[PDB]
Copies of this chain bind each other. A is one copy, B any other.
């Protein structure tokens, strides 16, 4: 207790009874489980992003507005079904629903658009349909590609080549769907931006009883590499027909978050099901509960022990900022980022504190949804004449959005992460600030 006694006197016992903080303070994983409390309410914003597949049940602008409000962060377009005209209309509807909230930039929630490819089929690699669909993606400015049936590093290179010179900024998330993809995982992760554990095909390609081993291994390896990992397929399957999920489905969603997944996905549940909005709301409710149940004490210790020494100032600042956030129970870590990289490096240490990422790049704001606990804020103001004042205005924008979004209150401590000069790659500063 002496390690939390002064902070308990200052913040109160009510603060320390919420968000599974009694379980967080435990000295062993066993004691942590024993202290999990159904009466300990989650307080933090939901950190695991929700990917919802867009289809006939979730295509209308009106329905998409409800889905964004329910918690959808990434809209998935499954190119296994529908024409280019159909998907272009889905993209337009998503963009219309997203831009309907651009009224106030303080609450504007960016939504990424992901293109999920049909796949190689009987072919040994990049199909002609995938080449056409990937070209459509670049032309329509998609943020992410979920590349189907990635079996080796050369499959990812073929996807990158098909995106051409104009699609260099698009994130490639390799879908691991068969035995070869699992066995060649390391070479695939090395050349990918992230991974999707595509359990539908994986569960038919390898014995169904082995899928959890592949899922846990891939999530662990992605967490170690600091690259986003998506858990997908049949997470809330029964909700395609019923308004409430089974006990196995709620458990699966909670366990994907506890495993370390950055994102969780909905397929038939939102694309064609009877309750698309309810499915998004259910993933949101479970992820909030499960994130608070993460045993950060061991996770942070293990991420530090396993991660190699780094001479990169962004990485060095990120670990210092996460350590500082844990020391004071910081409400948030506000970070300025051009590409999303500084926010991704904070996310890899899994802080309890929300990572509020302030960026001018609309694409980076959408793409950072791939990183757990990163809350993107799109800054729209033109640059100030003095650079230091432009940095300060962006930090204040993060604070004001954080106050109005519920993340921050007067009296809270926040960690602010910035760099010494303009441009990407120069993050090197960490500040402890009292919110006024």
Contact = CB atoms under 8 A, between A and B. Distances in A.
Interface of A: 2-7, 10-11, 20, 27-39, 179, 182-183, 199-200, 203, 206-217, 219-221, 223-224, 233-238, 244-256, 259, 282, 285-286, 288-290, 293, 298-299, 301-303, 305-311, 313, 315-317, 319-321, 323-324, 327-329, 413, 415, 420, 428-434
A212 B254 contact: yes
Contact of A324 (B10, B29, B219, B320): B320
A253 B247 CA distance: 11
B316 A30 contact: no
A315 B303 contact: no
B200 A306 contact: no
B182 A4 contact: no
> Is the contact region of chain A dominated by helix, strand, or loop, or is it mixed?
helix
Nearest to A306: B30
B217 A37 contact: yes
B211 A251 contact: yes
Contacts of A308: 2-7
Given A4-B308, A6-B310, 13 more contacts: A3-B305, A30-B306, A38-B206, A212-B286, A213-B289, A237-B246, A237-B248, A246-B248, A248-B248, A248-B251, A320-B323, A320-B415, A428-B433
B210 A317 contact: no
A419 to B, nearest CB: 10
Given A238-B237, A248-B234, A301-B301, A27 B29 contact: no
Nearest to A203: B247
A254 B199 CA distance: 15
Nearest to A434: B313
A431 B428 contact: yes
A305 B282 CA distance: 36
19 contacts: A3-B309, A29-B29, A29-B298, A34-B221, A34-B224, A36-B214, A203-B247, A208-B250, A246-B248, A248-B248, A251-B252, A313-B413, A313-B432, A316-B324, A317-B324, A319-B323, A323-B323, A429-B430, A429-B432
Given A305-B3, A307-B3, A315 B327 contact: yes
